[PDB]
Symmetry: D2
Subunit: 140 residues, 4 copies
């Protein structure tokens, strides 16, 4: 349901059961240099004070940047996992959607790096995340 | 609830409906300088490859560091929100628990900083998060 | 001098004696939303293995982001200081120049955020720095 | 003059000519899990406003964490370079010394991670740096 890249015939955990399926992350565009995703804000994404949870912006950035890397590297026999996620918070989001745009800025042999912007429905920049993704040969 | 600090009579979102209650975060210890929390790994905490989601370590650190700041500052008329969350991933977790310990290292008039360590059931350091928490006068 | 913003009649340390003047940082462009600076690589910018010091990219980003904030806020009675500097290193520099471009992405009442790109003489992205700048009322 | 680990018979750049020798960084203790260094504050370490430059704390952290890794890995045929440096600034330093303690918290096959604390002469925690060091086989 998430439109994550189809790079394998089966996956260990079905979309609807994962963190991402639970909060409702959906990938829209996906290219080697750029990917977008969004999510409808519901309480499941919020913390008790009624704001989108800082963790939700982190998770959306993490999935989008990792999977954008997976889309390219899996068929090359590689695995891609987050090694560093630095998200900074500029404006709270209370409702509507959060919309993430990941732009690739470095693609090394061992590390890819993506800048992710997280905007609210008015287009305001509410958070950014710098994602460093480790790329390593798959163990099996 | 998740045992979050009881600082107000009403909260906008019930624990069990927040991202925190959905994934199952529970605070164990809380003092002004040090707090701990933990979560059972379930699929809701995982991504589709079967590992604990990077976002889940970030969210655990974010709630713990923030709420451990709230516990001190709420009664002083202040709000505390995540301003920066830098989480780095050293070893994946596939199953069991993730346990977090937040140690406060700076308590400034406008910013508190917490180092958070995230450990598996074997005690191994799987991730760390450097949490910066903004502390502002509460709005009407 | 290094062409830093001229906002005060006296400064505690002369350009040529600061770390900035010692290594040779010079600001080229400065507007409220965007600033650029550059430095010639000399041994003073290098570490003992002959590469540009990681600290040198961090210092270039720090001075540029801070002073580009000073340029706006000093006349408003505010001081601006680095609060967080996250620099990530993609490709080393052995000789030539390092050129920095800071693009402002958030200008909040208490925090400004700048994305800084650090490029070699070939235009290649060698490092980036996410600069968070605290903005406070100036003390007597 | 810096007491950096002696792991090779010659180096590309002599200590006194490097950034580190110019500002005066000196390593005191050095073990596989922990290293310390300090530097006397002089104008060469300060910015124009008379404070220690944020870049100086970054550079001290960077050299100490990289070289602490070099001390162990060079004789194993590896190179160690900074891949990420995230320094956060809690209190300015105006004079005296800055004293850095690097503690190793993860030693992977490709990445080592060090927490560095930077204290003033009164022992106050003025800055911290999270250093991720890439370890790679040497090319020659
Ligand atoms: C960190 C890393 C090695 C990781 O690689 P990656 O993201 O997968 O990128 P990739 O491996 O594709 O390589 C990119 C470039 O890195 C360099 N590189 C990568 N691997 C190696 C290697 N094994 N040996 C030598 N150079 C390498 C190389 O220049 C490469 O370009 P190319 O020749 O392959 O086209 C690479 O991004 C890099 O070298 N970044 C720059 C590191 C840097 O310059 N840090 C600052 C200086 S070192 C730290 C320091 O300040 C210090 C100060 C004082 C002191 O006493 C000691 C150290
Ligand atoms: C960033 C911040 C202002 C945030 O404040 P916080 O976390 O709420 O801490 P708090 O406000 O409790 O204050 C801690 C100490 O900071 C200083 N401080 C805080 N607010 C102020 C203020 N409004 N005015 C003057 N000093 C202040 C002061 O020393 C304070 O101690 P105390 O005198 O109150 O006991 C404070 O942590 C701080 O001052 N940190 C250090 C910033 C720093 O030194 N950065 C590096 C140098 S500035 C950046 C730079 O490298 C640069 C280079 C070249 C160039 O041309 C320009 C800039
Ligand atoms: C961090 C900070 C307060 C810093 O302020 P700044 O960079 O100077 O920005 P500025 O003060 O100009 O304000 C920007 C917007 O922030 C909000 N804000 C700023 N100051 C305040 C304040 N004193 N009171 C209420 N809202 C404020 C407000 O929306 C403001 O817009 P406006 O209404 O003034 O137009 C502001 O950037 C901000 O609010 N960012 C978002 C913080 C955020 O949403 N973090 C994640 C959620 S809180 C952390 C968390 O996940 C958590 C999870 C579970 C749990 O149990 C507890 C916490
Ligand atoms: C990042 C890195 C691979 C780099 O390695 P390092 O710092 O040199 O550490 P090292 O290579 O020594 O290995 C440490 C452990 O990492 C794992 N690992 C390392 N290399 C590999 C590999 N090639 N294949 C599988 N596992 C590996 C392995 O568990 C290893 O332990 P051991 O079996 O070797 O004893 C390793 O630190 C690591 O795996 N860290 C954890 C990564 C992580 O769990 N990130 C979060 C989950 S993935 C990102 C994400 O959230 C996501 C969400 C949704 C979605 O749709 C996609 C992704």
């Amino acid at each position: 349901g998430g439109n994550l890249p189809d790079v394998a015939s089966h996956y260990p955990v079905a979309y609807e059961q994962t963190l991402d399926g639970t909060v409702g992350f959906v990938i829209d565009e996906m290219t080697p240099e750029r990917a977008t995703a969004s999510v409808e804000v519901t309480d499941t994404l919020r913390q008790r004070w009624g704001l989108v949870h800082g963790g939700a912006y982190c998770a959306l950035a993490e999935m989008l940047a990792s999977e954008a890397t997976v889309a390219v590297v899996h068929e090359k026999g590689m695995m891609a996992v987050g090694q560093s996620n630095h998200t900074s918070f500029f404006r709270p989001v209370k409702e509507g959607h959060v919309r993430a745009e990941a732009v690739r800025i470095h693609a090394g042999s061992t590390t890819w790096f993506w800048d992710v912007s997280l905007r609210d429905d008015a287009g305001r920049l509410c958070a950014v995340s710098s994602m460093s993704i480790a790329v390593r040969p798959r163990r099996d």
